[PDB]
């Protein structure tokens, strides 16, 4: 209804997940993931929300999302030294960061062992470091 | 055994508490001399990387730290560094502190002082479109 699609593309990501519940060492594969970013109105509050959703054909159980409002975003900005405001955030990553990964920015997705959660991480490599920009914890939709 | 790898005056942002009683910070752009060298530890014979900063504004502004391979491993771990101890200084010097040719954004240096000026954090940044892009920080101690 109020939902507005800002971004809907297939990107190459590295997918990591522990070998098992007891073995936290990751196995890692390059994989294609569909990322959708939209804005919507919270039904109870009327406030603006940013929704992130990932899926991939490889695994029907692979359905994750998170919704950020202004306050959730402030926490994110604080934790990652983000320099843009809530309203600018999606526009800048879409226009300056994500377009590069569509089927140098890198995307990592890290799964829970039980696949209840995944961390959606964006990177911009430096000559001496990984250059992690932020990570958002997404939860299983299913 | 000391070998100079880098000896240059750079523009930094200097942050420090208002006073010993006022923890809130004030910020100024300032010129700082940064020296990076390699040397042999006298007792162990191992290679050491020495960072030294100074500035003419304040004679008591004299800070250094020496990193050996082990100290570096801790740094690389804390900051997701992707190069080894031997490459570290060469890459920073050649790719982060270097002057680009006039024909991911420019590097920025932050120096954060202790209120008592016993320690300062030497921080290197490479700005992104949405974030500060802190690369690493090294705690230097008063000389």
UniProtKB/Swiss-Prot annotation, chain B:
Assembly and oligomerization: Nine homodimers form a cartwheel structure with an internal diameter of 23 nM and radial spokes connecting to the microtubule triplets. Interacts with sas-5.
Organism: Caenorhabditis elegans
Domain notes per entry: The coiled coil domain is necessary and sufficient for interaction with sas-5.
Full protein segment contained here: 3 to 167 of 492
Domain PISA stretches: 44-96
Disruption phenotype: RNAi-mediated knockdown results in failed centrosome duplication in embryos.
Its biological purpose: Central scaffolding component of the centrioles ensuring their 9-fold symmetry. Required for centrosome biogenesis and duplication.
Protein name per its UniProtKB record: Spindle assembly abnormal protein 6
Location relative to the cell: Cytoplasm; Cytoplasm, Cytoskeleton, Microtubule organizing center, Centrosome, Centriole
Protein's gene: sas-6
